[PDB]
């Protein structure tokens, strides 16, 4: 199965944080993919990060733990990767 940990940002500026496994969504892609461009999305769930895991152990321990860790220290998991500058949005520059 497809283990992907998304980690969106709320809002109220809470990370969000839960991993999916569909892969409804995958072929869901390609099936849209025909005839139809990648622009899709509006808010408020702003993607910080995407953990991809092909293992089931890590997959469940990574969001049980994530689950398990405080502010503090879910901070420094962003700040270990996921950082503003990895965003890679937009901000100003061309």
């Not at 025909?34 to 769930?45: C, E, L, S, V």
């Not at 993607?47 to 502010?71: D, G, I, Q």
């Amino acid at each position: 199965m497809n283990h992907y940990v998304y980690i969106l940002e709320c809002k109220d500026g809470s990370w969000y944080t839960g991993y999916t496994t569909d892969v409804d969504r995958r072929i869901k892609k390609h099936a849209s993919g025909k005839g139809a461009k990648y622009t899709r999305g509006r808010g408020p769930f702003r993607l910080v990060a995407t953990w991809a895991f092909p293992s089931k152990e890590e997959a469940m321990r990574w969001e049980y733990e994530v689950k398990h860790l405080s502010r503090r220290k879910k901070e420094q998991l962003v700040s270990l990767k996921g950082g503003p500058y990895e965003n890679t949005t937009k901000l100003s520059t061309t």
